[PDB]
Design an enzyme around this catalytic site. Structure first.
Site, PDB file in Angstrom:
ATOM      1  N   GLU A  11     -21.109 -15.316   4.572  1.00 12.96           N
ATOM      2  CA  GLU A  11     -22.121 -16.000   4.357  1.00 12.96           C
ATOM      3  C   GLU A  11     -22.906 -16.294   5.572  1.00 12.96           C
ATOM      4  OE1 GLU A  11     -21.693 -16.843   0.137  1.00 12.96           O
ATOM      5  OE2 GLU A  11     -23.315 -16.945   1.584  1.00 12.96           O
ATOM      6  N   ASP A  20     -31.908 -17.134   0.576  1.00 11.74           N
ATOM      7  CA  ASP A  20     -30.827 -16.111  -0.055  1.00 11.74           C
ATOM      8  C   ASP A  20     -31.231 -14.964  -0.053  1.00 11.74           C
ATOM      9  OD1 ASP A  20     -28.917 -17.146  -3.021  1.00 11.74           O
ATOM     10  OD2 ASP A  20     -29.950 -18.382  -1.387  1.00 11.74           O
ATOM     11  N   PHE A 104     -17.425 -19.136  -5.331  1.00  9.99           N
ATOM     12  CA  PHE A 104     -18.464 -19.759  -4.749  1.00  9.99           C
ATOM     13  C   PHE A 104     -19.855 -19.255  -4.502  1.00  9.99           C
ATOM     14  CE2 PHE A 104     -18.591 -22.135  -0.573  1.00  9.99           C
ATOM     15  CZ  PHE A 104     -19.902 -21.741   0.204  1.00  9.99           C
ATOM     16  N   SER A 117     -12.832  -7.454 -16.639  1.00 10.04           N
ATOM     17  CA  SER A 117     -12.231  -7.364 -15.286  1.00 10.04           C
ATOM     18  C   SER A 117     -11.234  -8.543 -15.100  1.00 10.04           C
ATOM     19  CB  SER A 117     -13.277  -7.839 -13.895  1.00 10.04           C
ATOM     20  OG  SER A 117     -14.514  -6.800 -13.992  1.00 10.04           O
ATOM     21  N   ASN A 132     -14.222  -1.437 -12.694  1.00 10.02           N
ATOM     22  CA  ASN A 132     -14.923  -2.267 -13.573  1.00 10.02           C
ATOM     23  C   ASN A 132     -15.885  -3.091 -12.722  1.00 10.02           C
ATOM     24  OD1 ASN A 132     -15.065  -5.142 -15.521  1.00 10.02           O
ATOM     25  ND2 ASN A 132     -15.105  -2.862 -16.581  1.00 10.02           N
TER      26      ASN A 132
END
Length: 164
Positions: A11, A20, A104, A117, A132
């Site tokens: 991040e 973002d 998160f 998955s 996958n």
């Protein structure tokens, strides 16, 4: 390596409001403020989140405090979620980190939609699940990060983060 170190590689740390990959207003260590296009709406969420008048800027200290709450909320969300808890409980410590990372980034809801998955990870079919998970918007939009998380589920080691 731990969940905090891992998420901070993925991040980053920004002390000023930023957008973002998605164009959304964020600050700190991946703390989304609002999905709304106004910097003004974002600034107001920020001051509400910190409890002061920030003017768009926070200290390291406030960033870490927000990060602590967000990881706590991610874990608690997994534990409260029927679909998620069952997979979490079945995994080893390192893979558990990989699921927390996804939660998160994308929220509980988002991750709970990766039905197939999840099913493979529960079954411990690591290679199949990795293939996958890569078939997703998530992988196509943030490939380097997704592939780090995916290797983490595939190997059960912190190798993808060694480099970094």
């Amino acid at each position: 390596m731990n969940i905090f170190e891992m998420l901070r590689i993925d991040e980053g740390l920004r002390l000023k409001i930023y957008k973002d990959t998605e164009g959304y207003y964020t600050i700190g260590i991946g703390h989304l403020l609002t999905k709304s296009p106004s910097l003004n709406a974002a600034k107001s969420e920020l001051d509400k989140a910190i409890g002061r008048n920030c003017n768009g800027v926070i200290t390291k200290d406030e960033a870490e405090k927000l990060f602590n709450q967000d990881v706590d909320a991610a874990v608690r969300g997994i534990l409260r979620n029927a679909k998620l808890k069952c997979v979490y409980d079945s995994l080893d410590a390192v893979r558990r980190c990989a699921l927390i990372n996804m939660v998160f980034q994308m929220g509980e809801t988002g991750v709970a939609g990766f039905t197939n998955s999840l099913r493979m990870l529960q079954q411990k079919r690591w290679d199949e699940a990795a293939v996958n998970l890569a078939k997703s918007r998530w992988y196509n939009q943030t490939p380097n990060r997704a592939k780090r998380v995916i290797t983490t589920f595939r190997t059960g080691t912190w190798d993808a983060y060694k480099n970094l």
